[PDB]
Amino acid sequence: GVHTFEEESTSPVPPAKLFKATVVDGDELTPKLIPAIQSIEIVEGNGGPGTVKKVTAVEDGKTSYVLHKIDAIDEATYTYDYTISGGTGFQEILEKVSFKTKLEAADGGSKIKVSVTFHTKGDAPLPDEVHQDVKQKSQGIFKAIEGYVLSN
């Protein structure tokens, strides 16, 4: 089943700075800023479309990981689309979760568009617990990096 959510938001950070921090340096910054995220390792690819990243996370001294795959990346349009699937840390009811993110310039800051598609096994609805856990983790990382760039 396909369950789609959108968020439109704003940042005082201009797009090039926000994209640099969230996408180009996101692998390096995230584990430094977020205690729960242990590491982000490129296991396949160059950093272009098809790159797979192993994202390792800790809860209550128990480690799990998920795989992060680049669907689209374009610095010029501030486009980053990626898919989360697989690994020990992935909710059993999910086939995959596909993110489409785009920034644009807005009065010296950014407009942010995120579209999230949860793909469930069979025709399962999306449990609110799974929706919330993925949203909180992905927004946590984004907001930590955004706050960091503002303080730099």
Structure, described:
- By secondary structure, the chain is of the alpha+beta class.
- It has one domain (1-152).
- It has 3 helices and 7 strands; from the N terminus they run E-H-H-E-E-E-E-E-E-H.
- A 7-stranded antiparallel β-sheet has the order 1-7-6-5-4-3-2, covered by helices on one side.
- The longest helix has 24 residues, at 128-151.
- The protein starts with a strand and ends with a helix.
- It is classed as allergen.
- Keywords: peanut, allergen, PR-10.
- The assembly is monomeric.
- The entry is titled "Crystal structure of Ara h 8.0201".
- The protein: Ara h 8 allergen isoform.
Characteristics of this structure?
7 strands; signaling receptor activity; globular; 152 residues; alpha+beta; plant defense
What's a quick, concise take on this entry?
The PDB classes it as allergen. This protein has helices at 15-24, 26-33, 128-151; strands spanning 2-11, 37-44, 52-59, 62-74, 79-85, 94-106, 109-120.
